[PDB]
Design a protein around this ligand. Sequence first.
Ligand SMILES: *C(=O)[C@H]([C@@H](C)O)[C@H]1CC(SCCNC=N)=C(C(=O)O)N1
Ligand SMILES: *C(=O)[C@H]([C@@H](C)O)[C@H]1CC(SCCNC=N)=C(C(=O)O)N1
Lengths: 234, 237
Amino acid sequence: SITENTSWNKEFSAEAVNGVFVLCKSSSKSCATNNLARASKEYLPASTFKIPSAIIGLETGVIKNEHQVFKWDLSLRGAIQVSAVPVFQQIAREVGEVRMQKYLKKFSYGNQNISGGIDKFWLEGQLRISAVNQVEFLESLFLNKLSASKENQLIVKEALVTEAAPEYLVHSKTGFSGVGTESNPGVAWWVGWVEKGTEVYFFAFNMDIDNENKLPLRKSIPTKIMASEGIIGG
Amino acid sequence: SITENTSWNKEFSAEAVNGVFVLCKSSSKSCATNNLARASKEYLPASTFKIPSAIIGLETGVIKNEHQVFKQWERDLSLRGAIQVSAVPVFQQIAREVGEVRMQKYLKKFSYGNQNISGGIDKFWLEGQLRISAVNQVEFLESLFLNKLSASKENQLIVKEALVTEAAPEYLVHSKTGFSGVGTESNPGVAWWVGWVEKGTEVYFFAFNMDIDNENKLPLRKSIPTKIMASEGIIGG
Ligand SMILES: *C(=O)[C@H]([C@@H](C)O)[C@H]1CC(SCCNC=N)=C(C(=O)O)N1
Ligand SMILES: *C(=O)[C@H]([C@@H](C)O)[C@H]1CC(SCCNC=N)=C(C(=O)O)N1
């Protein structure tokens, strides 16, 4: 029962941005968004796919453990933060089609369509996922409810930490498919969750982008909205 | 074999502080300190004991899991919240439920300092006879980092996560402060800052302690080691 919040539209209007922001408190049953419609629309996950991929990589053994080093050398958190294109293409290849499919089914990940090439389906393949689905997936991860060891889920959760403050911890992941065209604009993402006190907020944001100079709005807009809600005040 | 960096003492002299800093790269086999004599000297762990206490509490089931919540009425605290503030009673309760025997066994497995928990199961680390050196702190944190402690990998990961205090694109700082109090003329209190930095594919373990007889100096337990590590290029100034 996701409710809409017209107030948050102001932040998009201020920048002339077409996109959506989904923010949920405590669980995926209490969400709000500036565009209930786009909230359920499915888009290429791009780099946000690094989250389920890292979990699957660990679960299948492709990634030895939390201390696994990757030659472009990068740590798991380092590889998650940068493009590190070769790293995750290699992880995907090692996992393979059959195992990848099995896990996305277990994870209920978007349309679960990995067609387009084992080492690129999330960047230029048929995979698509919505902001609402991203939140449901991140919630399962937070609760250690994904079909993977709690050990591996915890490893990825710490690898996703991007901001630390005395009162909260922000876990997040960016994503960007590429400029594209007006008849088919690219999509930029920012998803994650904030642990503030004993409370938790899950969020998913995506926006049409036709110029890379608009990329910073992908983080600024959601940060402003969450800052107002007194969640991070960044 | 720990080496002694004389230049580090200038950071202590600048604030007229008596203390020690132990910093190691990759492992405890590559450590440096401003004073070999004090690096091995055991001191009251104070709040730094919350680290093994948290692991033991989780390993014994006393602490349900990572989502365990703890208790003018102040709202409940998360594991991370409880670790960062005083919340001494929270950990006193944990210690009581763990019990003398189990605590003793775990500190033995953890090779935690002098392993002397006598004189009150709920306060041996705050005023008891328990003592641990900066080098021992590093060894302990190293074991935690490698998941080599006698506890589930899961629980070690939960505690390591709860210890995150600074996040930058290039590094993650895990740390824990400590403060026994101001003590007295003949015996001042001790202040600590221990933890480790994951920078890229490298890891740096650190343990700092200083004598302190006035809370006015507390900020120094973080600033002195931060200056030293910042100078070494490990973390931002
Ligand atoms: C993930 O969605 C993309 C890419 C791997 O497809 C990465 C790269 C970028 S922006 C490009 C700059 N690369 C550095 N030289 C992002 C992003 O979303 O900002 N994620
Ligand atoms: C842990 O060792 C101490 C205490 C429980 O003994 C706690 C409380 C503090 S500082 C208390 C207020 N000081 C004011 N300037 C710390 C700490 O060292 O940060 N941990």
